[PDB]
Design a protein around this ligand. Structure first.
Ligand SMILES: C[NH+](C)c1cc(NC(=O)CNC(C)(C)C)c(O)c2c1C[C@H]1C[C@H]3[C@H]([NH+](C)C)C(O)=C(C(N)=O)C(=O)[C@@]3(O)C(O)=C1C2=O
Ligand SMILES: [Mg+2]
Ligand SMILES: [Mg+2]
Ligand SMILES: [Mg+2]
Ligand SMILES: [Mg+2]
Ligand SMILES: [Mg+2]
Ligand SMILES: [Mg+2]
Ligand SMILES: [Mg+2]
Ligand SMILES: [Mg+2]
Ligand SMILES: [Mg+2]
Ligand SMILES: [Mg+2]
Ligand SMILES: [Mg+2]
Ligand SMILES: [Mg+2]
Ligand SMILES: [Mg+2]
Ligand SMILES: [Mg+2]
Ligand SMILES: [Mg+2]
Ligand SMILES: [Mg+2]
Ligand SMILES: [Mg+2]
Ligand SMILES: [Mg+2]
Ligand SMILES: [Mg+2]
Ligand SMILES: [Mg+2]
Ligand SMILES: [Mg+2]
Ligand SMILES: [Mg+2]
Ligand SMILES: [Mg+2]
Ligand SMILES: [Mg+2]
Ligand SMILES: [Mg+2]
Ligand SMILES: [Mg+2]
Ligand SMILES: [Mg+2]
Ligand SMILES: [Mg+2]
Ligand SMILES: [Mg+2]
Ligand SMILES: [Mg+2]
Ligand SMILES: [Mg+2]
Ligand SMILES: [Mg+2]
Ligand SMILES: [Mg+2]
Ligand SMILES: [Mg+2]
Ligand SMILES: [Mg+2]
Ligand SMILES: [Mg+2]
Ligand SMILES: [Mg+2]
Ligand SMILES: [Mg+2]
Ligand SMILES: [Mg+2]
Ligand SMILES: [Mg+2]
Ligand SMILES: [Mg+2]
Ligand SMILES: [Mg+2]
Ligand SMILES: [Mg+2]
Ligand SMILES: [Mg+2]
Ligand SMILES: [Mg+2]
Ligand SMILES: [Mg+2]
Ligand SMILES: [Mg+2]
Lengths: 97, 140, 107, 190, 95, 166, 148, 181
RNA sequence: UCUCUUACUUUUAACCAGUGAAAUUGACCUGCCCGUGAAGAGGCGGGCAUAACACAGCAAGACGAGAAGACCCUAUGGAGCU
RNA sequence: ACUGAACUCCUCACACCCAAUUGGACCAAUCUAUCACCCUAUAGAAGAACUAAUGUUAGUAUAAGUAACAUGAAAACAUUCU
RNA sequence: CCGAGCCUGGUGAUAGCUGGUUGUCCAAGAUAGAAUCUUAGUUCAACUUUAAAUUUGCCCACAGAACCAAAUCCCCUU
RNA sequence: GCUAAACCUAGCCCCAAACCCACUCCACCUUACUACCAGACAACCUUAGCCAAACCAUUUACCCAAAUAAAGUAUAGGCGAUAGAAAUUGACUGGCGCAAUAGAUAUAGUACCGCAAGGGAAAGAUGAAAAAUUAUAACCAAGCAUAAUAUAGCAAGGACUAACCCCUAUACCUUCUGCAUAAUGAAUUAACUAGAAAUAACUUUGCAAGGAGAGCCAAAGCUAAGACCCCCGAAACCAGACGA
């Protein structure tokens, strides 16, 4: 049997947090601030994913270039094997040629 | 393990409630129940046609029994009632055979008379009068 | 399926229509929410159709209870002791009209 | 969605530990053929199509569209009586209960987005009220955005803000094609 | 072909297609006839002229070459004295 | 696990009005984790089903099974708590209403087969459950008489309706 | 996906492979259509219709010498020195309705484009712009931000 | 543990349903059941029977001696149905005796007495009363309403309709509800 | 050894008591004859047969279990040898 | 003459019977945004749905209480005997 | 389990070959051929599907299609 | 009513930030974990192959010193598959992550297996108090028990007063010209377990001879979005260790 026998603990949400209450602020900083910043400079994340999308193969190629030097060994190897697998999949396999 | 199915119980019971009168492990084990519940629902869908056919066959059998109790045959009764312009169907003819036997004897007599008038007309072959119950009310 | 469900014969409640027709619907209970998007057609039914329905069926008592609810519903109770609970969750006012009239016509 | 970085990552079969050897001979045993115990079919195996790495959801709407959305949101606030132009945002006390009673008397929403012109020159009174109020949020004009105006039932703008917004949102309509980014000088652009 | 390269994650051109065919900007592909510089002593002059013509390609072959080249080869090119400048556009073409 | 049989001997009933039948006594007893098979306990418990307490104790005293000895110990304990804690007057006025056996928590142990093969053995454990009710053992259901078979047949020849008509 | 084979298995051969027949893009013979394409010079056409339209809408000042900078600032031509653009060529289109005196500097000019500027009473001259210098004249502000 | 709330909520409503069909709750009067308004119920009773009852006379056709005495005991910690009940019962006997003896003129008197005593009997009168919302409006001490109390209440509404509408309209009701039986 | 097999003992066996596996298993309320049919039927057609249920024995069938045929063919699959 | 279909009529209603493939209309749960507050709404997302891989792990069956396993005898439990 | 040990790694080797491929409902829908170390596959054609644009499409009549049978092609009416 | 079933927390994942870890005593390169004796030896060599080229034999991307752009351009190449620049340009403390078959293999590199190199697990759940063990917790998988069975047949369906009897009905999936097939797979339950993206096209917004927040396209285009490309399985090949 795979169903809870009791109700789960209640999930109370503050829709008026500082984070929720100030989501989206300064997202028009360029068009409302004489184009001195960009919302892509407002993005906070990994250094290889600030203002760039990519698919998985493009993301793996991009991370190995910006930070493959300062990268742990096992995780670098795994990235090299991942790029090799994704090259073979995206260039040779599929239904549409 | 993000996004797992949490209502599979209710899906299994939606199938299983239609199997609880089955015999064996197919009344409780989903992998066998589904196979038998689809078949119970297909059989139900086709049994509508079979119900109509078997009910007509039953009416014809009962009408045959009652006509033979009056010495008449079923094709004779049916054909000569249509010739008498009586458009009672086989359901109500079996019903009259069961619940109104004097009415059914009157109908069997009417069909017998219509058959005798047909025989007289066939033997006469000329222009004798049509026959009292062989006249056809015309509609325009 | 028939072999898998209950059955009964054609019947009426108390020889209905022999001397007089009596409407078998007794009560219609309507739970509606004031702020719920599920209860929009139910709010519109209580604002425009329930009063004329009441006037057309004087033998039916219609209770309307506006309370916080996720699934608005209609509980139809009948002279023979029967209760029929139907959700009117996310239905338009025309569909609620059709459902309520169908409960008014059923025994 | 444009600033989203999803951080969910699973391991593929290649990245789960072990699993190099073939578990049991291809032929001879009455069992199913397997090449690795970290195959996606196996308990503790890799994930076939799972989330991969940190993943960016970054894209850019055209800036004319983004400015148009700003204009539309201002227009719908005016059209639905959720816009209040003010001379300045100075309050006589600096008290949250004063601000809430004021909004309740003036029949504003349960949430007010109060917008001044410049973060540096913001009246201390409002910066004291809008530091304990959670539903009453003060933002500089440079921070105006459609998401904030749709979360807040009411929008209190000032007159300097109104002029600022009108200038910045009509330059977009009477503007050329860029020829290089507008951070670089041009003849008539600040 | 290569749909995503390994150094730049991009689509690659088939340089065989580039070294054999010419794309007009209207979307037509131009080729030479096969065997135009081969065994001419056995070919008659009508056949030789037929082989010396510059001929167009199919819809199927055009879509195939457009897939085997990247978008750099489909841009408009304002060369100085291009002999195909006339043919880079269509005139009076209905449907 | 589940241990609901031992909470049944703790139902307090409301006090009885002076014009109602006396309400026989019910005593629930059971032994858990018996080193025996439930499929052999079944035959022992189906044999003592519906018997008097003394007749059951006789049959168990002369039966040859380990389970018969265990069920005798459980029945004697149940009789003792019947007239010690549930206010049964006579210790012979009891009968076995319910007598069943359930699976216990078992253990798995390897059984070395030949070649290189193994079998997993089960160290089987069982439960034995007994409900005693105050009173004489109820009269057994008598066999059907020819008169009862005929009356049933004629009821059915008289229950026949004309099918698929008005 | 289909039933079996390379289709359902996702292993069908590459684009241009025709099952083993010598493929079309291989059996056509090589001919130098695009031999030195990357070194061929390119000149964006500016018509006299376009120049007159720009002047009439006031995007190019006729009272000052018009050069490539004034034609990229008034946004009448877009020049890409990386796509081997070498400037603007003045072409004869709209020479019959050209009515404007101008001092225009281009990189290439037709006899009928020159003639029209000179019947209205203006001067046309053709100058050469090195690719780097062409970058400098078309976008003068990023060069001044390089500060060499 | 799986994430979510909706399946757990559905499972709890399923558990509550089975607990009810396992330890069923005691039968309770509709008056205690929540959605209930007595004056509206009385008016709807009259309107669905299509008769112009007088509301005070109807309300007294549902007030039994047992409610009076039990509510007096609850007061320790007005008019019954008796007069109306005896009028209704007597008119029921006379009207059905006349109906049956003009329809079936060759029946002996013993046969018409026994027919009148089946249509004015506990089983028929209780069936008709229960299926016409008389139990739901009967003010008494015990629930379910004892069959004698139900019979008294039913013939008291015939007494009320007699007093409110007349011996022809009441006679049409008797026809439509006791002859149909 | 056989014509041509018999007798006895021990093991096994069967019954009682204790302990307690394995392959196998779509679901089965799991019959015979002729015919049919993916060409050899418990399950389809026509006939016949038929209260229910253990224990022992047998090996004609369930194209019985086991082992993704060792033979033959194929694969722009391998490998050893010359 | 009659019987004889899902054919045709009749009462009412109609999008409601092909493989591969292709087009469309909906949609369970979950998370997020804003709602909603006995379990929902509008959208945004995604490890988003299993009667079948001699699938993987765990539980319990069938075979089956079957195959198979074990302790020389008496006695005072000192001993003695085979 | 030595026609070439075992373990780890490259390795998620490769498999035109078998097996598998998960909610509901409606709809359109059955294959002339050519190449190919190819015939257990693919590519092009044909057939099929969707979306657009336009004008004819099927059935067909006289007349008509070679010298050394049934029929077809063509084809206005309809 | 047994077996059971439920459960939120250990912890973990991706990032950000930030330069990480070694002398209680004693012992430890000999047969390590050994107080204490005549020696000395000593490090540096291009990976290869699977695979792709539908065989294969030259060839077949593997961070190498912040983004972008030039550009998949010049070039290279059985000129095939594919490979591919530069000048120049200008560049902290979170979670639309997992929650015990998941997330680390991890409760642990432990138990256990292997001579060795090496391989490698499983699992836990009261309460405020257990210096309250209390009976009100029960309800839910398969398997059983309560409670064996009754002519006849894919086990149902139409029915029926009536469980059966009567009539009708050749399991499913895959595979195939065609399967009730005596062709494949499956005892059953619970969980886990399989469609990833380009070139274009189409749809819907924006702006429009121009569009785009440098680079690029443009003889109505350009910008943005939406929407399409699976899982398991060999026998092998090569590199480095470990084994007589
Ligand atoms: C049964 N015998 C007569 C046999 C027959 C064949 N086939 C034929 O001769 C041809 N028969 C046909 C034509 C197919 C009907 C056979 O082909 C074989 C064998 C024997 C096996 C023995 C195998 C065995 N293993 C599998 C248990 C084994 O121990 C060895 C070994 N050397 O250790 C083997 O040799 C063995 O693997 C093997 O090779 C056999 C056969 O090939
Ligand atoms: Mg690995
Ligand atoms: Mg097996
Ligand atoms: Mg493998
Ligand atoms: Mg895992
Ligand atoms: Mg051994
Ligand atoms: Mg398949
Ligand atoms: Mg195929
Ligand atoms: Mg035994
Ligand atoms: Mg099998
Ligand atoms: Mg067949
Ligand atoms: Mg046969
Ligand atoms: Mg069979
Ligand atoms: Mg036997
Ligand atoms: Mg076999
Ligand atoms: Mg095989
Ligand atoms: Mg083989
Ligand atoms: Mg081949
Ligand atoms: Mg080969
Ligand atoms: Mg090879
Ligand atoms: Mg018919
Ligand atoms: Mg999935
Ligand atoms: Mg399975
Ligand atoms: Mg056996
Ligand atoms: Mg034995
Ligand atoms: Mg070895
Ligand atoms: Mg593979
Ligand atoms: Mg169709
Ligand atoms: Mg060849
Ligand atoms: Mg070939
Ligand atoms: Mg092939
Ligand atoms: Mg190859
Ligand atoms: Mg291949
Ligand atoms: Mg560079
Ligand atoms: Mg784990
Ligand atoms: Mg683990
Ligand atoms: Mg169960
Ligand atoms: Mg039958
Ligand atoms: Mg399937
Ligand atoms: Mg075949
Ligand atoms: Mg067969
Ligand atoms: Mg089969
Ligand atoms: Mg077969
Ligand atoms: Mg086989
Ligand atoms: Mg096969
Ligand atoms: Mg499952
Ligand atoms: Mg090789
Ligand atoms: Mg030795």
């Amino acid at each position: 049997i795979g169903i809870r026998l009791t109700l789960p603990p209640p999930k109370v949400v503050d829709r008026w947090n500082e984070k929720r209450a100030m989501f989206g602020v300064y997202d028009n900083i360029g068009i409302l601030g004489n184009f001195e910043k960009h919302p892509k400079e407002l993005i906070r994340g990994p250094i290889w994913l600030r203002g760039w999308k990519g698919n998985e193969l493009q993301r793996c190629i991009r991370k190995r270039k910006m930070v493959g030097s300062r990268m742990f060994a096992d995780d670098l190897h795994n990235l090299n094997k991942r790029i090799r697998y994704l090259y073979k999949h995206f260039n040779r396999h599929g239904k549409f040629r | 393990l993000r996004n797992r199915v949490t209502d599979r119980y209710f899906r299994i019971q939606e199938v299983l409630k239609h199997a609880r009168h089955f015999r064996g492990r197919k009344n409780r084990c989903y992998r066998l129940a589904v196979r038998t519940v689809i078949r119970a629902f297909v059989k139900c869908t086709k049994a509508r046609y079979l119900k109509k056919k078997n009910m007509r066959t039953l009416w014809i059998n009962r009408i045959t029994a009652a006509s033979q109790e009056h010495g008449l045959k079923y094709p004779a009764l049916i054909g000569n009632l249509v010739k008498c312009q009586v458009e009672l169907n086989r359901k109500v003819l079996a019903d009259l055979a069961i619940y109104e036997p004097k009415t059914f004897k009157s109908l069997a007599a009417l069909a017998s008379r219509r058959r005798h008038e047909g025989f007289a007309a066939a033997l006469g072959d000329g222009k004798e009068p049509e026959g009292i119950f062989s006249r056809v009310v015309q509609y325009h | 399926t028939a072999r898998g469900t209950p059955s009964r014969f054609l019947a009426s409640v108390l020889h209905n229509g022999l001397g007089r027709y009596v409407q078998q619907l007794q009560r219609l209970s309507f739970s509606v929410s004031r702020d719920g998007a599920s209860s929009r057609g139910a709010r519109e039914f209580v604002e425009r159709e329930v009063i004329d329905f009441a006037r057309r069926n004087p033998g039916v008592v219609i209770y309307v209870n506006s309370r916080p609810c996720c699934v608005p519903r209609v509980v139809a109770e009948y002279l023979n002791g029967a209760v029929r609970e139907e959700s009117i969750h996310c239905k338009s006012v025309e569909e609620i009209s059709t459902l309520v009239q169908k409960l008014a016509d059923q025994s | 969605n444009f600033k989203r970085i999803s951080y969910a990552k699973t391991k593929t079969r290649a990245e789960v530990r072990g699993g190099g050897r073939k578990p049991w001979p291809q032929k001879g045993t009455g069992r199913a053929r397997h090449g690795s115990i970290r195959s996606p079919l196996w308990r503790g195996g890799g994930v076939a199509h799972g989330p991969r790495g940190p993943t960016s959801y970054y894209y850019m709407l055209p800036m004319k569209v983004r400015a148009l959305g700003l204009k539309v949101a201002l227009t719908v606030k005016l059209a639905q009586d959720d816009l209040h132009i003010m001379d300045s945002l100075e309050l006589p006390t600096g008290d949250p209960q004063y601000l809430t009673e004021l909004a309740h008397y003036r029949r504003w929403g349960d949430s007010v987005l109060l917008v001044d012109l410049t973060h540096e020159e913001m009246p201390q009174s409002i910066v004291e009220a809008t530091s304990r109020l959670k539903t009453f949020n003060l933002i500089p004009a440079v921070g105006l955005n459609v998401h904030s105006m749709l979360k807040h039932q009411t929008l209190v703008l000032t007159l300097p803000t109104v002029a600022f917004l009108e200038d910045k949102l009509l330059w977009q309509d009477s503007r050329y094609r860029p020829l290089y980014p507008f951070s670089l000088p041009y003849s008539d652009f600040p | 072909l290569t749909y995503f390269s390994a150094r730049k994650g991009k689509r690659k051109t088939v340089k065989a297609v580039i070294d054999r065919f010419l794309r007009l900007h209207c979307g037509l592909w131009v080729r030479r006839k096969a065997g135009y510089k081969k065994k001419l002593w056995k070919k008659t002059p009508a056949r030789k002229k037929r082989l010396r013509e510059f001929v167009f390609c199919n819809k199927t072959q055009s879509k195939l070459l457009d897939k085997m080249t990247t978008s750099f080869w489909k841009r408009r090119n304002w060369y100085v004295d291009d002999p195909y400048q006339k043919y880079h556009d269509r005139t009076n073409l209905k449907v | 696990i589940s241990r609901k049989w031992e909470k049944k001997n703790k139902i307090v009933y409301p006090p009885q009005l002076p014009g109602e039948p006396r309400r026989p006594a019910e005593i629930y007893h059971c032994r858990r984790q018996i080193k025996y098979s439930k499929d052999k306990m079944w035959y022992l418990a189906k044999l003592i089903r519906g018997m008097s307490i003394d007749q059951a104790l006789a049959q168990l005293e002369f039966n040859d099974k380990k389970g018969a000895k265990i069920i005798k110990e459980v029945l004697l304990e149940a009789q003792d708590m019947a007239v010690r804690d549930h206010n049964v007057e006579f210790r012979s006025n009891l009968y076995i209403a319910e007598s069943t056996s359930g699976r216990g928590q078992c253990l798995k142990r390897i059984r070395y087969h030949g070649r290189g093969r193994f079998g997993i053995m089960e160290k089987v454990y069982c439960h034995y459950f007994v409900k005693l009710v105050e009173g004489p053992p109820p009269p057994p259901e008598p066999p059907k008489t020819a008169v009862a078979h005929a009356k049933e047949y004629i009821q059915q020849l008289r229950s026949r309706t004309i099918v698929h008509t008005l | 996906r289909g039933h079996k084979g390379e289709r359902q298995r996702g292993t069908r051969p590459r684009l241009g492979f025709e099952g083993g027949q010598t493929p079309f893009y291989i059996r056509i013979p090589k001919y130098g259509f695009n031999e030195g394409h990357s070194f061929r010079r390119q000149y964006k056409p500016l018509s006299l219709n376009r120049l007159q339209y720009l002047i009439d809408l006031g995007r190019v000042d006729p009272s000052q010498p018009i050069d490539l900078t004034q034609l990229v600032n008034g946004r009448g031509v877009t020049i890409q020195p990386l796509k081997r653009d070498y400037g603007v060529q003045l072409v004869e289109e709209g020479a019959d309705t050209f009515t404007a005196k101008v001092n225009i500097e281009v990189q290439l000019a037709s006899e009928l484009a020159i003639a029209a500027i000179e019947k209205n009473g203006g001067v046309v001259t053709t100058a050469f712009y090195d690719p780097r210098s062409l970058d400098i004249v078309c976008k003068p502000v990023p060069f001044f931000l390089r500060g060499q | 543990v799986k994430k979510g709330f909706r399946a757990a909520f559905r499972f709890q409503k399923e558990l509550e349903r089975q607990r009810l069909l396992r330890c069923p709750p005691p039968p309770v009067r509709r008056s205690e059941k929540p959605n209930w308004d007595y004056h509206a119920e009385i008016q709807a009773f009259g309107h669905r029977l299509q008769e112009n009852f007088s509301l005070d006379l109807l309300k007294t056709a549902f007030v039994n001696s047992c409610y009076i005495k039990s509510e007096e005991a609850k007061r320790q910690q007005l008019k019954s149905n008796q007069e109306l009940s005896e009028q209704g019962t007597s008119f029921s006997q006379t009207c059905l005796t006349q109906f049956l003896e003009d329809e079936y003129p060759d029946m002996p008197t013993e046969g018409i007495k026994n027919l009148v005593d089946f249509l004015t009997g506990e089983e028929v009168v209780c069936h008709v009363a229960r299926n016409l919302a008389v139990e739901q409006l009967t003010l008494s001490e015990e629930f379910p309403v004892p069959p004698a109390v139900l019979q008294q209440t039913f013939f008291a509404v015939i007494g009320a309709l007699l007093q409110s509408s007349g011996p022809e309209r009441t006679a049409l009701f008797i026809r439509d509800f006791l002859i149909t039986q």
